[PDB]
Design a protein around this ligand. Structure first.
Ligand code: ACA
Ligand code: MN
Ligand code: MN
Ligand code: ZN
Length: 476
């Protein structure tokens, strides 16, 4: 078969590195009238993205023609898959021509193809490195119009280019976007925000007086913790690295941060999403069986990730640590409810249940309506997550919750829900086990009614490392 031969020939070069031969085969396929498929086109694109940018003369044919092949694939109405956007993008990144990267995205839109976030990157970042703010905002406007949602890298780029070109409006809007989409910022973004607030442009923006009533209503309207009506106050900013105490009180300025509400409608939307995603990966009957059991049980004040509580900081499963966590959760329940323990069926049988009194207690929890053993082969993370969300209660787990399953849940609602519901254990030599409860305020960029800002840095584990904030408040 002709296209099967081209597949095989293109699989070979390049797993060999041979761009020249891939390009020869490309032009040959056209002279023979063999129509290239999706698979062929992807291999071509990947292979061309192995070519390098000529630090000495005219661009290399592999990069130049790489774009031309991309252009052709779309013209041919050949559907792009995830490999296409990835290869298309590394092509764009290798070339490092923001204008050409932008053309690729304009072409996808032309032909009704949804561009991906990685498609926009080389265009956005290209312009940003060259200080071309206007071009950067064009790419941004295009990305927004395509309903592609930026992440922290894209926003930090936009923030930097806005700072570089003294655009206080665009700084404000980007900072709002960071609040809305990212919440807590990386070290480098944090440093950049700090620079902004200390800068001459920031000193010189603002208003001496404003419609206090309009700010009030914007606070209500936004959900709390910001107003979005623009820079307030005048003069130099006092900008300090600081911390919040356990009550959300800024140690620098004594402002008490807001606890921002979660709309219960969003929670019901998320619960439905969860069921949909779980039933796509679990045996549907196993997940449904849990849902039905949960409907006949409760109420619960807490759900325990049993495997994580048995295992976190242990060389092997500790029934002690699970049992101590169960008792501590029951003690803080106002009515002393046992928590719902989610445990693998594999973990109820064998050991920790090696010791008969432990076995008998696990069965006691099950008979009290407070243990569900997840079937062999199931991913029990769907089960304790769905239980806590559905029962509207505390979730006791030290699971990071940023491994693949959890990337599926998104970066808007889930991180806000987690902050309000997640209980983590910590253990010391001196005191034993401690429950670390959700904070009584929201750990997010906040903008006060008088225009004062508090910006949280993102950390690995805020129990391990004490979270730094920026306090930015006008001097007079
Ligand atoms: N610290 C956790 C090690 C193994 C964890 C098992 C789990 O989290 O589901
Ligand atoms: Mn788990
Ligand atoms: Mn896990
Ligand atoms: Zn403060």
């Amino acid at each position: 078969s002709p296209e099967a031969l081209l597949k095989q020939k293109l699989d070979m070069c390049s797993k060999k590195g041979d761009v020249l031969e891939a390009l020869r085969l490309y032009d040959e396929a056209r002279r023979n009238g063999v129509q290239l498929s999706q698979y062929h086109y992807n291999v071509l694109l990947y292979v061309c993205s192995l070519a390098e940018a000529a630090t000495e003369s005219s661009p290399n044919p592999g990069l130049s023609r790489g774009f031309d092949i991309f252009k052709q694939m779309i013209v041919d109405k050949v559907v792009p898959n995830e490999a296409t956007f990835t290869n298309g993008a590394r092509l764009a990144v290798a070339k490092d021509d923001p204008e050409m990267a932008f053309d690729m995205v304009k072409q996808m839109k032309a032909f009704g193809i949804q561009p991906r976030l990685r498609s926009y990157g080389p265009a956005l970042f290209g312009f940003c490195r060259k200080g071309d703010a206007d071009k950067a905002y064009e790419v941004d406007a295009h990305m927004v119009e395509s309903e592609v949602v930026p992440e922290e890298p894209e926003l930090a780029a936009l923030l930097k280019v806005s700072m570089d070109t003294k655009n206080a409006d665009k700084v404000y809007k980007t900072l709002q976007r960071l609040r809305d989409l990212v919440r807590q910022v990386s070290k480098s973004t944090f440093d950049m925000i700090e620079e902004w607030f200390k800068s001459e442009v920031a000193t010189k923006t603002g208003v001496k007086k404003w419609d206090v009533k309009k700010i009030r209503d914007a606070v209500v309207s936004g959900g709390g913790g910001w107003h979005g009506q623009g820079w307030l106050g005048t003069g130099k900013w006092n900008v300090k690295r600081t911390e919040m105490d356990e009550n959300g009180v800024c140690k620098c300025c004594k402002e008490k941060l807001v606890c921002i509400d979660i709309n219960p409608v969003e929670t019901e939307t998320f619960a439905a999403s969860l069921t949909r995603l779980a039933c796509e990966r679990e045996v549907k009957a196993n997940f449904n069986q849990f849902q039905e059991w949960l409907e006949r049980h409760g109420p619960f004040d807490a759900v325990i990730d049993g495997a994580n509580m048995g295992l976190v900081n242990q060389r092997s499963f500790s029934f002690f640590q699970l049992n101590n966590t169960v008792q501590r959760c029951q003690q803080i329940s106002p009515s002393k409810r046992l928590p719902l323990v989610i445990l693998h069926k594999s973990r109820v049988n064998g050991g920790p249940a090696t010791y008969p009194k432990n076995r008998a207690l696990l069965e006691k929890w099950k008979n009290a309506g407070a243990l569900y053993a997840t079937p062999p082969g199931s991913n029990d993370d769907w089960y304790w997550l769905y239980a806590a969300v559905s029962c509207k209660c505390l979730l006791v787990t030290n699971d990071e919750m940023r491994d693949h399953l959890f990337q599926l849940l998104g970066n808007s609602f889930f991180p806000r829900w987690k902050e309000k519901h997640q209980v983590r254990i910590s253990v010391t030599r001196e005191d034993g086990l401690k429950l670390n409860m959700p904070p009584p305020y929201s750990i997010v960029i906040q903008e006060s009614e008088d225009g004062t800002w508090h910006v949280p840095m993102s950390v690995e584990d805020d129990l391990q490392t004490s979270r730094q904030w920026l306090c930015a408040k006008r001097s007079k």
